[PDB]
Amino acid sequence: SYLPGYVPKTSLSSPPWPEVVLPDPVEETRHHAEVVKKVNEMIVTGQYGRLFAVVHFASRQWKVTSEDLILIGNELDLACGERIRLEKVLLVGADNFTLLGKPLLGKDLVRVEATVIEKTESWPRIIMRFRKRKNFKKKRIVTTPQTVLRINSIEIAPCLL
Amino acid sequence: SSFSRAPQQWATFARIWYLLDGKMQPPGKLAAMASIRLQGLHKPVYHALSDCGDHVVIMNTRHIAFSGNKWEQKVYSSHTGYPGGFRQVTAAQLHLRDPVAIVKLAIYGMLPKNLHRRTMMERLHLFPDEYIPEDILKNLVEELPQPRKIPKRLDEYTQEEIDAFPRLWTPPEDYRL
Amino acid sequence: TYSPLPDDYNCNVELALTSDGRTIVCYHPSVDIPYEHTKPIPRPDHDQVLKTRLEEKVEHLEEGPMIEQLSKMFFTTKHRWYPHGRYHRCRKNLNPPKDR
Amino acid sequence: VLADLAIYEPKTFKSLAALASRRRHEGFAAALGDGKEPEGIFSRVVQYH
Amino acid sequence: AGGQWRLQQGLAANPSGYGPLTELPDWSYADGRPAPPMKG
Amino acid sequence: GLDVIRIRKPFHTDNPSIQGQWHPFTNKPTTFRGLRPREVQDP
Amino acid sequence: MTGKELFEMWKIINPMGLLVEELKKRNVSAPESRLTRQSGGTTALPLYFVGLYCD
RNA sequence: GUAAAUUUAACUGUUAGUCCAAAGAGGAACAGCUCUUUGGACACUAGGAAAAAACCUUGUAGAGAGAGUAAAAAAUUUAACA
C-alpha cells in the first residue's frame, strides 16, 4: 500500500522548507506578455509621474531623478552648459512599474539627459604618512577635479513590446 | 507619499512596540531577535547615531526552555567587590530568584558594548507570566513569531495523526509488556 | 497560483520578461488598506456657581525627580537630561548645513 | 543603490526581492532536476559578444 | 559576490572587467554626437 | 562661486522618493478590525 | 517651486473643511476618518496613521 | 625566458641579529639557551590570527559614498545479555 521510497511522516522525513511549484513555462510565457503589454500601455498613455533611474557613470552608480545634482569626481572635457545623454541606465522606475536591464536597458527604451553646470576642484585633502622623521612640514595636499551635473530629464519610450 | 515634511520624518523614525512570547523558547533565540529590534537593525533607515531602536516586550520569561543541561551547567558569576564577594549561581538558581534575569542577561550580552546599550535596555519590557500592564498592551503593534517550534506531546496528537503513522513492528502476543 | 512573495502588504508584484528577454518588467501598484482592517477614530472624552479656574498645573520638581520623570516618560537613561559645560555648549554649531 | 532603493523605493525594492526569490526557486528546481528539463525563464542568461 | 557564477557564464569574475557595462561609452552629446573615447 | 569646502554628499535631490519614503508600516500587513497583539474584539 | 510641497507655498487653515467642499463639488461622499495604523498610543512618542474613506 | 652585467673615474654610509621552518654540532632530545649552515619574515605597506616586530594574506605609493577577491570561525563525551 506504499511506494518503494515511502517514508512515514516525521520531523526529518522531508525537508522543513515548504515545497514550491513554479508556474508552467508555457502558461507563464503567456502571462508575461500580458504584463509587458499592460506596462507598455501605461507608458503609451503617460500613466506615470516622476521617474527615477540608476545610471552607471564614472565607474559609479547613481540613483537619480529629474532636477538632481551629482558630483562627478573628475573632469569631463566638456564646457559648462553642455547637455549630454547618460547612456548606461541599469534601472528606470515609476510609481507603479520598474524596468530592469540585463544589465543595461536599451537606448530605445529610456533616455536620461544631464547638463554640466559647474567645473571645479575639491577642497584640499591632506595626505600624511607617519614615517620616522619630522612629519608636519612634509604634509602633502591634493585637490581633485570635479564636475557637477544636473539631471535634466528622464524619458521612457513605449518599446517594451 | 505627499506627506508634510514634519509628519513624514515622524513616521519614518517612529518607535514600534513588538510582542514576543517566551514560552518554551530558548533565551538566546529570544535575545537574538530582541537585540536586532532594540537597535533598529531591522530597519532600512538604520544608523548607529540615529536613535532608531524599537520597544520589545517579552512575556512568559519564566517559561523559557534551555536546551541540553544548561539549567545545571550554565553558571552566572558576579562579584560584590568585597573580599570573598565572588558569587556563582547556576541558571536554575538564578531563574528561581529572578524569573526575568536569564532573558535579560542574554539580551544584555548581545547588545553592542557602548554607551547606547543601557538606553536600549530601557525599551526592553520583560514579564514573567502572561500579565502585561494595560498601558503596555495598548502600545503593542506586532507579535513576532516564536523562534523555536514547540514539539507536540504524545497526548497532544490527534487520533487521525496517530492512525496515519504505521505500526513498525509486530509485538509478540505472549509478551507481558 | 505561485507568488515569489506574499501580496497582502506594500504592493502586488508581477514579474515579466520581455519577448527579447533582455528586459525585466515589474508591475507594482500600491495595496490600499481595506476599510475592514481599520478602527473608528477614537472620540475624545452640579453647583458650579463660580467660574472655572485655569489652575496652573506647573509643579516644581527637583532635578533628580524631574530627570527620573523625563527618563521614564521617554524610556531613556538619566545621563542625557543633565546639562553640559560651556565648552561643549559653545562648540555646537547653531547654523548647521541643511539638505532639502 | 540597493540600500538607497530600500529606503526611498520600497515597491521597486520588493520587486527586486521578488525577482531574487523567484530566481532562487528556479535554482532549487534545477538542482533537483537532472538537466533534462529546460532552464527557468528568469534563469536564462543574455549573452554578449 | 557572484564571481564564480559569472565565470561559469564566460564573463569576467568582476562585473567591472570586460563587457558592455565597462567598455561602452558612459555618455554622448545630447544631439547624438559620440563622445571622445574614455581614458580607461 | 560656492565655498570650496568639504561637500558632505556627492549628490543632491529635492525628490529622493518616487514611491514613498520607508516607514515602519511600509511592509507590515494590516489586520482585520485593526486588532493589536493579544487584543480582544467585542471587549 | 522646485522641491517645495504645495502647502508650503499656499498656506491654508482647516484642510478638512476645504476637502469636504471640494468633494461636494465632485459629488463624492463626505470623507470618513479611521485609524489605519497605531503604535505606542499610551506613550509620549506615539504614531498614528489616519485614512480618509469615501464609500 | 629575460635585462642586466663587467670595466673605468670618484665617493659615502651601514654592518654588536631577533623570531619562524629545515639540517647538524653542544647543553638536559630545558630556556625567548650555545655554535654553524639553507631559506623566510622583521628598520617599506596593509588585511587576518583576541591584544600581536618574527605566523598567514599582501607587497606599499593619489582621489571615489563602486566592484571581484586573499588570508580569515577547532573539535570531542568514551558497550552488554544471562
UniProtKB/Swiss-Prot annotation, chain A:
Oligomeric form and interacting partners: Component of the mitochondrial large ribosomal subunit (mt-LSU). Mature mammalian 55S mitochondrial ribosomes consist of a small (28S) and a large (39S) subunit. The 28S small subunit contains a 12S ribosomal RNA (12S mt-rRNA) and 30 different proteins. The 39S large subunit contains a 16S rRNA (16S mt-rRNA), a copy of mitochondrial valine transfer RNA (mt-tRNA(Val)), which plays an integral structural role, and 52 different proteins.
Keyword Mitochondrion: yes
GO biological process: mitochondrial translation
UniProt GO cellular component terms: mitochondrial inner membrane; mitochondrial large ribosomal subunit; mitochondrion
Keyword Ribonucleoprotein among record annotations: yes
Residues of the whole record sequence present: 45 to 205 of 205
Species assigned in the record: Homo sapiens
Assigned keywords, A-Z: Mitochondrion, Ribonucleoprotein, Ribosomal protein, Transit peptide
Molecular-function GO term, any one: structural constituent of ribosome
Family that this chain belongs to: Belongs to the bacterial ribosomal protein bL21 family.
Compartments reported by the entry: Mitochondrion
Source species, domain of life: Eukaryota
Name the UniProt record assigns to this protein: Large ribosomal subunit protein bL21m
Curated annotation (Swiss-Prot), chain C:
Biological process (GO), any one: mitochondrial translation
Record's signal peptide: none
A single Gene Ontology CC term: mitochondrial small ribosomal subunit
Subcellular location: Mitochondrion
Coiled coil: none
UniProt GO MF annotations: RNA binding; structural constituent of ribosome
Main location (coarse class): mitochondrion
Keywords: Mitochondrion, Ribonucleoprotein, Ribosomal protein, Transit peptide
Superkingdom per UniProt: Eukaryota
Subunit structure: Component of the mitochondrial large ribosomal subunit (mt-LSU). Mature mammalian 55S mitochondrial ribosomes consist of a small (28S) and a large (39S) subunit. The 28S small subunit contains a 12S ribosomal RNA (12S mt-rRNA) and 30 different proteins. The 39S large subunit contains a 16S rRNA (16S mt-rRNA), a copy of mitochondrial valine transfer RNA (mt-tRNA(Val)), which plays an integral structural role, and 52 different proteins.
Family to which the UniProt record says this protein belongs: Belongs to the mitochondrion-specific ribosomal protein mL42 family.
The protein's name: Large ribosomal subunit protein mL42
Annotated source species: Homo sapiens
Curated annotation (Swiss-Prot), chain E:
Subunit structure: Component of the mitochondrial large ribosomal subunit (mt-LSU). Mature mammalian 55S mitochondrial ribosomes consist of a small (28S) and a large (39S) subunit. The 28S small subunit contains a 12S ribosomal RNA (12S mt-rRNA) and 30 different proteins. The 39S large subunit contains a 16S rRNA (16S mt-rRNA), a copy of mitochondrial valine transfer RNA (mt-tRNA(Val)), which plays an integral structural role, and 52 different proteins. mL52 connects the central protuberance to the body of the ribosome.
Record's keyword annotation contains Ribosomal protein: yes
Recorded family membership: Belongs to the mitochondrion-specific ribosomal protein mL52 family.
Subcellular location: Mitochondrion
BP terms from Gene Ontology: mitochondrial translation; translation
Keyword terms of this UniProt record: Mitochondrion, Ribonucleoprotein, Ribosomal protein, Transit peptide
Protein name per Swiss-Prot or TrEMBL: Large ribosomal subunit protein mL52
GO cellular component: mitochondrial inner membrane; mitochondrial large ribosomal subunit; mitochondrion; nucleoplasm
Residues of the full protein shown: 23 to 62 of 123
Key word Ribosomal protein present: yes
Molecular-function GO term, any one: structural constituent of ribosome
Natural source organism: Homo sapiens
From Swiss-Prot, chain F:
Compartments where found: Mitochondrion
Tissue: High relative levels in skeletal muscle and testis. Lower levels of expression in the heart, brain, placenta, lung, liver, kidney, pancreas, spleen, thymus, prostate, ovary, small intestine, colon and leukocytes. Expression is coregulated with TWNK.
Superkingdom assignment: Eukaryota
Quaternary organization: Component of the mitochondrial large ribosomal subunit (mt-LSU). Mature mammalian 55S mitochondrial ribosomes consist of a small (28S) and a large (39S) subunit. The 28S small subunit contains a 12S ribosomal RNA (12S mt-rRNA) and 30 different proteins. The 39S large subunit contains a 16S rRNA (16S mt-rRNA), a copy of mitochondrial valine transfer RNA (mt-tRNA(Val)), which plays an integral structural role, and 52 different proteins.
Family named by the database record: Belongs to the mitochondrion-specific ribosomal protein mL43 family.
Name of the protein in question: Large ribosomal subunit protein mL43
Organism: Homo sapiens (Human)
Higher taxonomy: Eukaryota, Metazoa, Chordata, Craniata, Vertebrata
First and last residues shown, out of full length: 109 to 151 of 215
